[PDB]
Amino acid sequence: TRPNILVVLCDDLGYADVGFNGSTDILTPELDNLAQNGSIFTSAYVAHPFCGPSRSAILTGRYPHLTGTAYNLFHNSSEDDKDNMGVPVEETYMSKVLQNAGYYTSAIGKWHLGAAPKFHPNKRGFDDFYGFLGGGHDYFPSEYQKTYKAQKKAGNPNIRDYVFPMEHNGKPANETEYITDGFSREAIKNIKIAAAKKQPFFIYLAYNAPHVPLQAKAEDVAKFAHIKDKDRRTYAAMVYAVDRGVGKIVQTLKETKQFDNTLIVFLSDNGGNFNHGANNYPLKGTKGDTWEGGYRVPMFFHWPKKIKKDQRFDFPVSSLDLYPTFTGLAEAKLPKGKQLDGKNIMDDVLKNTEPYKDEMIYSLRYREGYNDVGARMGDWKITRMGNEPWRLHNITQDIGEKKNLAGRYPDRLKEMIAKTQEWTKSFVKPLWVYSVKDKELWESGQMPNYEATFEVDKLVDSPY
């Protein structure tokens, strides 16, 4: 009997901001209990260090550099199909694949993969959608509904999508509670629906917490009243509210007897933003970086029927693995011609085998005139940040990327740079960029200039 699949995806959760991954000040007892009863992934990576492209990769199973979606959609992006402001519809999502294999599919919370009808969740493999289409949202309906009406009362032609009414399959959601609590409430409802249907479920629970604005319930803040920094205190309360809902979700799974045969996957979509309450310790950097802190995230698998308790999986994996792993477990057939950049790791997880032995896990982030790069194989990682000289780290011994080994092992450095450059030969042009500056640089050819990105000696050689 095929398992249910529950993906709990948080938004900008820092590497050190759940108990099972080292937090000393944020309490996440429900998440910790799930993690201790499953497999914790100590080297898990998303395919891009910020929101839109990471989510594009999770659902398409491809790097955003291959689908044209490596920039975020701007807020209030176009809602007209003629404008193709969304992930290409030809790139079939794993939700549609699971849907075509008889799964009850549900998407809750944040989307950010296109606000026009052809990009809507109900058209991309989801029987049920409850959430918002853009990149973020205010958390309290009492506050943001008032603002929305008032802004209509002045005929405001550019109302921020952070205050738009949310929707349930295209109709007004009429949410009445702190939206983290509402998304938990909708997850429970959809679990009860699938149980009543005696149908396996796939639920994509995309919390916007703890993404800005930092807004939290008074009852949650009180659990952290001793934290003096206000942003950290509020951020902790936000993470705690997600934890409360996972505990309620777990109770529902047990009452409906779906707990033992549900694969629960929990992760963050990118590294924490350390300007807005997050802590990525012991990693270097912040959301958006190709330092580990940008795209290495907490993650666990929990599936009592098959994954042993107290497991730690220390081999590097990618969020790109979720697509082939889920379609495999679903016994689903892939669409003809579907290209995938990850692999099914369920067997590797059960037997503690290395899925990426002698293979690369990459990141490339476009900047204003240059690219940040990161690439890991085994214990070795190469990094370029700020267009500075290339760095080589033994990421297993130097998790903080403090000791540059490029000088001691230049052969390894250039071999890893060679493979990474070849990878960028397969890229497509971005379907959209983010800023006016971006558009100029790509039109002038100043971007992408992958050739300059993979220079090595001239960055370090003296001309004298």
Question: Which residues are annotated as part of the binding site?
Answer: 11-12, 51, 269-270
| 96 is a contact residue toward Br ion (CB under 5 A) | yes
Q: Say which residues have a Cβ less than 8 Å from residue 390's Cβ, sequence separation at least 6.
A: 382, 383, 384, 406, 413, 417, 456, 459
Closest to Br ion by CB, 132 or 370: 132
Smallest gap from residue 125 Cβ to Cl ion (A): 27
The closest of 289, 294, 300 to 322, measured between CA atoms, is 300
| 93 is a contact residue toward Br ion (CB under 5 A) | yes
Inter-CA distances, 84 with 71, 113, 393, 430, Å: 14, 11, 40, 12
- Check if 10 is active-site: no
Map the footprint of Ca ion across residues 243-282, applying CB under 5 A.
Answer: 269-270
Closest to a copy of itself by CB, 415 or 455: 455
What is the full DSSP assignment across 53-66?
Answer: HHHHHHHHSS-HHH
**Residue 327 and residue 98 in contact, taking contact as beta carbons nearer than 8 Å:** yes
Extract the runs of DSSP E, i.e. beta strands, from 111-147: 128-132
Contact pick of 11, 167, 289, 348 for Ca ion (by CB under 5 A): 11
Binding pattern to Cl ion, positions 131-170, x when CB under 5 A?
A: --------------x--x--x-------xx----x-----
Residue 426 binds which one of Br ion, Ca ion, a copy of itself, none, with CB within 5 to 8 A depending on kind? none
| 464 is a contact residue toward a copy of itself (CB under 8 A) | yes
What single-letter amino acid sits at 351? K
Residue closest to Ca ion when measured from CB atoms: 51
Q: What does the block give as tokens for 259?
A: 């707990």
Smallest gap from residue 365 Cβ to Br ion (A): 15
| 234 is a contact residue toward Br ion (CB under 5 A) | no
Residue 51 binds which one of Cl ion, Ca ion, Br ion, none, with CB within 5 to 8 A depending on kind? Ca ion
Binding pattern to Cl ion, positions 403-422, x when CB under 5 A?
A: ------x-xx----------
Considering 65, 112, 137, 276, which one is annotated as catalytic?
112
**Residue 303 and residue 263 in contact, taking contact as beta carbons nearer than 8 Å:** yes
User: Within 13 Å and on the Cβ side, how many CA atoms surround 72?
Assistant: 15
| 51 is a contact residue toward Ca ion (CB under 5 A) | yes
Inter-CA distances, 47 with 254, 256, 268, 317, 433, Å: 33, 34, 12, 10, 18
Considering 10, 51, 137, 276, which one is annotated as catalytic?
51
Write the DSSP symbol of residue 156: -
Contact pick of 42, 147, 151, 387 for a copy of itself (by CB under 8 A): 387
Contact pick of 77, 270, 290, 311 for a copy of itself (by CB under 8 A): 77
Smallest gap from residue 304 Cβ to Br ion (A): 8
Inter-CA distances, 292 with 212, 270, 336, Å: 21, 10, 35
Write the DSSP symbol of residue 255: H
Q: Which secondary structure element, helix H or strand E, spans residue 262, and what is its range? A: strand 262-268
The closest of 431, 454, 450 to 64, measured between CA atoms, is 431
Binding residues for Ca(2+): 11-12, 51, 269-270
Map the footprint of a copy of itself across residues 253-312, applying CB under 8 A.
Answer: 275-276
Q: Which stretch binds a copy of itself (CB under 8 A): 5-13, 34-42, 92-100, 397-405?
A: 397-405
- Check if 48 is active-site: no
Q: What does the block give as tokens for 216?
A: 């939290």
| 206 is a contact residue toward Ca ion (CB under 5 A) | no
- Residue ranges binding Br ion (CB under 5 A): 92-93, 96, 124, 165-166, 173, 175, 257, 259-260, 275
Active site residues: 51, 112
